[PDB]
Design a protein around this motif. Structure first.
Motif, PDB file in Angstrom:
ATOM      1  N   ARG A  12      49.806  37.346  43.938  1.00 30.91           N
ATOM      2  CA  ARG A  12      51.215  37.559  43.630  1.00 30.91           C
ATOM      3  C   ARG A  12      52.107  36.905  44.681  1.00 30.91           C
ATOM      4  O   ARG A  12      53.185  36.399  44.368  1.00 30.91           O
ATOM      5  CB  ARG A  12      51.520  39.055  43.546  1.00 30.91           C
ATOM      6  CG  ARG A  12      51.385  39.780  44.875  1.00 30.91           C
ATOM      7  CD  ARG A  12      51.770  41.246  44.753  1.00 30.91           C
ATOM      8  NE  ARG A  12      53.218  41.428  44.689  1.00 30.91           N
ATOM      9  CZ  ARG A  12      53.800  42.527  44.225  1.00 30.91           C
ATOM     10  NH1 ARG A  12      53.063  43.539  43.787  1.00 30.91           N
ATOM     11  NH2 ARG A  12      55.124  42.619  44.199  1.00 30.91           N
ATOM     12  N   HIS A  13      51.648  36.917  45.928  1.00 33.06           N
ATOM     13  CA  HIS A  13      52.404  36.324  47.026  1.00 33.06           C
ATOM     14  C   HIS A  13      52.644  34.839  46.780  1.00 33.06           C
ATOM     15  O   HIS A  13      53.765  34.350  46.925  1.00 33.06           O
ATOM     16  CB  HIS A  13      51.662  36.521  48.349  1.00 33.06           C
ATOM     17  CG  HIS A  13      52.381  35.948  49.531  1.00 33.06           C
ATOM     18  ND1 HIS A  13      53.637  36.363  49.920  1.00 33.06           N
ATOM     19  CD2 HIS A  13      52.014  34.989  50.412  1.00 33.06           C
ATOM     20  CE1 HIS A  13      54.012  35.682  50.988  1.00 33.06           C
ATOM     21  NE2 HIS A  13      53.044  34.841  51.307  1.00 33.06           N
ATOM     22  N   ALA A  14      51.586  34.125  46.409  1.00 36.16           N
ATOM     23  CA  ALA A  14      51.684  32.696  46.143  1.00 36.16           C
ATOM     24  C   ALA A  14      52.949  32.369  45.357  1.00 36.16           C
ATOM     25  O   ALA A  14      53.938  31.899  45.919  1.00 36.16           O
ATOM     26  CB  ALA A  14      50.453  32.215  45.388  1.00 36.16           C
ATOM     27  N   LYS A  15      52.912  32.621  44.052  1.00 36.97           N
ATOM     28  CA  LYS A  15      54.056  32.354  43.188  1.00 36.97           C
ATOM     29  C   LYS A  15      55.356  32.788  43.858  1.00 36.97           C
ATOM     30  O   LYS A  15      56.346  32.057  43.843  1.00 36.97           O
ATOM     31  CB  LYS A  15      53.891  33.081  41.852  1.00 36.97           C
ATOM     32  CG  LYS A  15      52.614  32.716  41.115  1.00 36.97           C
ATOM     33  CD  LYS A  15      52.508  31.218  40.890  1.00 36.97           C
ATOM     34  CE  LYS A  15      53.680  30.692  40.076  1.00 36.97           C
ATOM     35  NZ  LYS A  15      53.839  31.430  38.792  1.00 36.97           N
ATOM     36  N   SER A  16      55.345  33.980  44.445  1.00 37.25           N
ATOM     37  CA  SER A  16      56.525  34.511  45.119  1.00 37.25           C
ATOM     38  C   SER A  16      57.222  33.424  45.930  1.00 37.25           C
ATOM     39  O   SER A  16      58.444  33.276  45.871  1.00 37.25           O
ATOM     40  CB  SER A  16      56.137  35.675  46.032  1.00 37.25           C
ATOM     41  OG  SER A  16      57.206  36.595  46.170  1.00 37.25           O
ATOM     42  N   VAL A  17      56.438  32.664  46.688  1.00 34.98           N
ATOM     43  CA  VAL A  17      56.979  31.589  47.512  1.00 34.98           C
ATOM     44  C   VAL A  17      56.455  30.231  47.057  1.00 34.98           C
ATOM     45  O   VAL A  17      56.393  29.285  47.840  1.00 34.98           O
ATOM     46  CB  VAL A  17      56.629  31.791  48.998  1.00 34.98           C
ATOM     47  CG1 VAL A  17      57.228  33.089  49.516  1.00 34.98           C
ATOM     48  CG2 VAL A  17      55.121  31.774  49.197  1.00 34.98           C
ATOM     49  N   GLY A  18      56.079  30.145  45.785  1.00 41.32           N
ATOM     50  CA  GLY A  18      55.565  28.898  45.247  1.00 41.32           C
ATOM     51  C   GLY A  18      54.477  28.297  46.115  1.00 41.32           C
ATOM     52  O   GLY A  18      54.582  27.151  46.549  1.00 41.32           O
ATOM     53  N   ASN A  19      53.429  29.074  46.370  1.00 44.77           N
ATOM     54  CA  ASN A  19      52.317  28.613  47.194  1.00 44.77           C
ATOM     55  C   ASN A  19      51.202  28.033  46.329  1.00 44.77           C
ATOM     56  O   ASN A  19      50.103  27.763  46.812  1.00 44.77           O
ATOM     57  CB  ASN A  19      51.773  29.762  48.044  1.00 44.77           C
ATOM     58  CG  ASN A  19      51.582  29.367  49.496  1.00 44.77           C
ATOM     59  OD1 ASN A  19      50.764  28.502  49.812  1.00 44.77           O
ATOM     60  ND2 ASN A  19      52.335  30.001  50.386  1.00 44.77           N
ATOM     61  N   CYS A  20      51.494  27.844  45.046  1.00 43.92           N
ATOM     62  CA  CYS A  20      50.517  27.297  44.112  1.00 43.92           C
ATOM     63  C   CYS A  20      49.922  25.998  44.647  1.00 43.92           C
ATOM     64  O   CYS A  20      48.777  25.659  44.349  1.00 43.92           O
ATOM     65  CB  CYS A  20      51.167  27.050  42.749  1.00 43.92           C
ATOM     66  SG  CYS A  20      49.980  26.702  41.412  1.00 43.92           S
ATOM     67  N   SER A  21      50.708  25.275  45.437  1.00 44.75           N
ATOM     68  CA  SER A  21      50.261  24.011  46.012  1.00 44.75           C
ATOM     69  C   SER A  21      48.977  24.203  46.813  1.00 44.75           C
ATOM     70  O   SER A  21      48.112  23.327  46.840  1.00 44.75           O
ATOM     71  CB  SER A  21      51.351  23.419  46.906  1.00 44.75           C
ATOM     72  OG  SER A  21      52.605  23.412  46.246  1.00 44.75           O
ATOM     73  N   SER A  22      48.862  25.355  47.467  1.00 46.21           N
ATOM     74  CA  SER A  22      47.687  25.661  48.275  1.00 46.21           C
ATOM     75  C   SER A  22      46.427  25.685  47.413  1.00 46.21           C
ATOM     76  O   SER A  22      46.451  25.282  46.250  1.00 46.21           O
ATOM     77  CB  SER A  22      47.863  27.008  48.978  1.00 46.21           C
ATOM     78  OG  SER A  22      47.307  26.977  50.281  1.00 46.21           O
ATOM     79  N   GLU A  23      45.330  26.162  47.993  1.00 47.69           N
ATOM     80  CA  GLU A  23      44.062  26.237  47.279  1.00 47.69           C
ATOM     81  C   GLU A  23      43.553  27.675  47.225  1.00 47.69           C
ATOM     82  O   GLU A  23      42.886  28.075  46.270  1.00 47.69           O
ATOM     83  CB  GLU A  23      43.018  25.340  47.949  1.00 47.69           C
ATOM     84  CG  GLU A  23      42.011  24.747  46.978  1.00 47.69           C
ATOM     85  CD  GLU A  23      42.518  23.483  46.312  1.00 47.69           C
ATOM     86  OE1 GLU A  23      43.680  23.103  46.569  1.00 47.69           O
ATOM     87  OE2 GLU A  23      41.754  22.874  45.534  1.00 47.69           O
ATOM     88  N   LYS A  24      43.871  28.448  48.258  1.00 45.42           N
ATOM     89  CA  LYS A  24      43.449  29.841  48.329  1.00 45.42           C
ATOM     90  C   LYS A  24      43.715  30.560  47.011  1.00 45.42           C
ATOM     91  O   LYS A  24      42.956  31.443  46.609  1.00 45.42           O
ATOM     92  CB  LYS A  24      44.176  30.558  49.469  1.00 45.42           C
ATOM     93  CG  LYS A  24      43.607  31.931  49.786  1.00 45.42           C
ATOM     94  CD  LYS A  24      44.216  32.507  51.054  1.00 45.42           C
ATOM     95  CE  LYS A  24      43.222  33.381  51.802  1.00 45.42           C
ATOM     96  NZ  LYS A  24      43.502  33.413  53.264  1.00 45.42           N
ATOM     97  N   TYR A  25      44.795  30.175  46.340  1.00 46.47           N
ATOM     98  CA  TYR A  25      45.161  30.783  45.067  1.00 46.47           C
ATOM     99  C   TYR A  25      45.268  29.728  43.970  1.00 46.47           C
ATOM    100  O   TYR A  25      46.131  29.809  43.096  1.00 46.47           O
ATOM    101  CB  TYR A  25      46.488  31.534  45.199  1.00 46.47           C
ATOM    102  CG  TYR A  25      47.077  31.480  46.590  1.00 46.47           C
ATOM    103  CD1 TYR A  25      46.931  32.547  47.468  1.00 46.47           C
ATOM    104  CD2 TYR A  25      47.781  30.365  47.025  1.00 46.47           C
ATOM    105  CE1 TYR A  25      47.469  32.503  48.741  1.00 46.47           C
ATOM    106  CE2 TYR A  25      48.321  30.312  48.295  1.00 46.47           C
ATOM    107  CZ  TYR A  25      48.163  31.383  49.149  1.00 46.47           C
ATOM    108  OH  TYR A  25      48.700  31.335  50.415  1.00 46.47           O
TER     109      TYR A  25
END
Length: 36
Positions: A12-25
């Motif tokens: 949930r945190h990812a999207k929150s700060v648009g971390n989709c770019s990462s790989e962990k999520y």
């Protein structure tokens, strides 16, 4: 299957700060990212 492995709290945190770019999520949480 590509079901979100990590916890919704960690995904949930990812999207929150648009971390989709990462790989962990993105590799395990493809369902939360939008790759699979």
């Amino acid at each position: 299957a590509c079901k979100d492995v990590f916890p919704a709290a960690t995904c949930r945190h990812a999207k929150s700060v648009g971390n989709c770019s990462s790989e962990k999520y993105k590799r395990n949480c493809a369902i939360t990212c939008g790759a699979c």
